[PDB]
Design a protein around this ligand. Structure first.
Ligand SMILES: OC[C@H]1O[C@H](O)[C@H](O)[C@@H](O)[C@H]1O
Length: 620
């Protein structure tokens, strides 16, 4: 069909003009034709574009894993919004979008078959101030601080003030701030490794007797004392930020068959790409991170890809992540916990985490399973259909009769509930919103947190990925109704092809948060782990916890660096039907296995040179 262009409504490529009123005009046009039946392709004549929040769309939104029922941060601000429509494909043709203030960069709601392709995303003054410490001198107690061009500032002797550009409609400034920001993170520009440190103490901002400008973007900080940290500080990018997920980066809440291709995510404000209930998602050729031509150290405010409680097939292909303030991909759901039995067919359940609430997670016709929090094992034959939902609607409204608070939902099940269910004792899980997952040919580098996180009972493939500098657990498969309340239990996890290296901690770490371990029945069933090359410096390759019919074959392990401590490569807590079979353990590695709440009658190293309980240190 037809191809509408932003050019005709006021989008002037390379103008520094609010292109957001024009966008909102063109998206209306785009809906009219689509609703006639067409296949609109909103196109952006190539070049820069400025998008300010002033006249952007304002929507009330409770999003997963942001700020839950906070009333300050309810009404968000999308810049490119595809609400209730179909068959639209937004093509920036390689343009560089640059947003302003604090806003959601683009969203899609109540849509089916829309696509975003081929453009850049950045912010004019980033909301995460990354200062590098270039030199320091312990003598007269001074320091040097590189602050990139992107950040605007103004000094008043002992104190420093940061601010943003102004609002072209009011002449007013979008965010002001001072000295140390609440939370801070560290990436070593030289050694290239993200060693986080006490995120509440920023040694740049301690006893600062006076700040002077050395020109050329530098800064000379005077000091009273100067502790161990501030001295060794040479070459560390202290990435200052705040810990309020006030906006999602991208929002995709109730969509069907979206695609995100070829978007350079140079910076997002607020969070990452929140998908929150969506039948299928596909994410090719994305690049999260900045470049070395830039002086920026983080393209993440926190997460990058969040897929809270989605369906169909979540796909991440041919992409790339570098230095976030949270994980790259975390696919999951959310456990709500039963806080009342209104009938043998009617229950009230509650959003038990403060950062996740507000939106509805159950839809009439859906299917819920029940779960005992103790072992995090599912109640036998508890699976049920939902017949009426009385909750919030995620826009601050009512669904059905209502629930009376954004933290509670009221469900009615097709048949009476299994009798074992008890208030505050069992959590409930929406099993219909369970995404199959395919994560292939991506690269993740220098993250401080984990690499991937996937917790779903549909098929799970993680094939031919490169993990380098994973500062924590390379891959983490949790499932947890203790603290975080992120569902759920996995059932088909295959982890082929990948290459791990320079891991700071474990590589693969399955670890439900069940406080009662069970040695008769296990939380996760079925898992295969093969084709993989691993590079270790005396670390755990696998760290199971309540897995069954687990397999660790065909892999290869080498000592990273060209008698001893350093963990045995394998640790298993409460597992069944494990097998090992045909691996390649380098000389010097501790090719052994630690059991725990578990007996060696459950391991099959008959076809393998791993040792159950011994170091098994490989010789020449
Ligand atoms: O479980 C780790 C934790 O990591 C981040 O903080 C996310 O925001 C949470 O939703 C959770 O995924």
């Amino acid at each position: 069909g037809d191809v509408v262009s932003v050019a005709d409504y006021g989008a002037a490529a390379d103008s520094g003009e609010d292109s957001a009123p024009a966008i909102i005009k063109a998206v209306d046009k785009a809906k009219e034709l689509a609703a006639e039946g067409k296949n609109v392709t909103i196109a952006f004549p190539k070049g820069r574009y400025d998008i300010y929040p002033d006249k952007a769309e304002r929507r009330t939104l409770y999003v997963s894993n942001t700020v839950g029922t906070n009333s300050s941060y309810k009404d968000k601000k999308i810049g490119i919004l595809l609400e209730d429509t179909k068959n639209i494909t937004v093509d920036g043709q390689g343009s560089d979008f640059v947003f302003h203030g604090k806003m959601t960069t683009f969203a899609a709601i109540n849509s089916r078959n829309v696509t975003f392709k081929n453009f850049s995303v950045d912010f004019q003054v980033p909301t995460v101030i990354d200062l590098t410490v270039e030199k320091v001198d312990a003598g007269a107690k001074t320091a040097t601080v590189y602050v990139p061009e992107e950040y605007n500032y103004r000094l008043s002797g002992s104190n420093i003030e940061w601010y943003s550009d102004s609002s072209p409609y009011t002449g007013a400034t979008y965010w002001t701030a001072s000295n140390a920001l609440p939370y801070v993170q560290l990436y070593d520009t030289k050694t290239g490794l993200t060693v986080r440190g006490d995120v509440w103490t920023n040694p740049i901002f301690q006893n600062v007797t006076g700040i002077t400008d050395a020109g050329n973007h530098r800064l000379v900080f005077s000091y009273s004392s100067m502790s161990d940290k501030l001295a060794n500080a040479t070459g560390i990018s202290y990435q200052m930020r705040q810990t309020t997920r006030d906006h999602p980066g991208v929002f995709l809440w109730k969509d069907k068959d979206v695609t995100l291709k070829g978007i350079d995510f140079r910076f997002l404000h607020g969070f990452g790409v929140v998908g929150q209930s969506t039948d299928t998602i596909t994410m090719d050729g994305l690049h999260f991170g900045t470049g070395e031509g830039t002086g920026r150290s983080t393209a993440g405010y926190a997460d990058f890809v969040q897929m809270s409680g989605c369906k169909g097939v979540i796909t991440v292909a041919n992409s790339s992540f570098s230095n976030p303030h949270d994980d790259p991909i975390n696919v999951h759901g959310t456990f709500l916990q039963v806080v009342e039995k209104i009938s043998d067919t009617k229950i009230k359940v509650r959003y038990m985490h403060n950062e996740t609430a507000g939106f509805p997670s159950f839809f009439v016709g859906d299917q819920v399973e029940f779960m005992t929090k103790g072992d995090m094992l599912p109640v036998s034959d508890s699976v049920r259909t939902v017949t009426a939902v009385d909750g919030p609607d995620g826009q601050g409204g009512d669904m059905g009769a209502g629930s009376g608070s954004l933290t509670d939902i009221v469900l009615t099940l097709d048949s009476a509930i299994p009798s074992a269910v008890a208030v505050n004792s069992h959590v409930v899980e929406n099993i219909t919103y369970t995404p199959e997952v395919n994560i292939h040919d991506n690269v993740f580098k220098e993250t401080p947190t984990r690499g991937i996180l996937v917790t779903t009972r549909k098929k799970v493939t993680i094939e031919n990925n490169l993990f380098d500098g994973m500062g924590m657990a390379g891959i983490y498969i949790s499932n947890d109704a203790q603290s975080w309340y992120e569902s759920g239990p996995t059932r088909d996890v295959t982890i082929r092809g990948n290459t791990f290296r320079r891991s700071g901690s474990d590589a693969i770490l399955v670890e439900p948060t069940n406080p009662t371990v069970s040695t008769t029945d296990t939380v996760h069933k079925n898992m295969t782990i093969e084709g993989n090359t691993f590079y270790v410096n005396g670390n755990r390759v696998l760290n199971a916890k309540s897995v069954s019919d687990l397999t660790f074959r065909d892999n290869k392990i080498y000592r990273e660096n060209p008698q001893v401590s350093g963990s045995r490569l394998f640790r298993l807590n409460g597992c069944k039907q494990v097998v090992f079979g045909g691996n390649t353990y380098d000389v010097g590695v501790k090719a052994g296995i630690d059991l725990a709440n578990m007996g060696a009658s459950e391991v099959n190293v008959s076809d393998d040179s791993a040792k159950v309980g011994a170091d098994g240190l490989v010789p020449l």
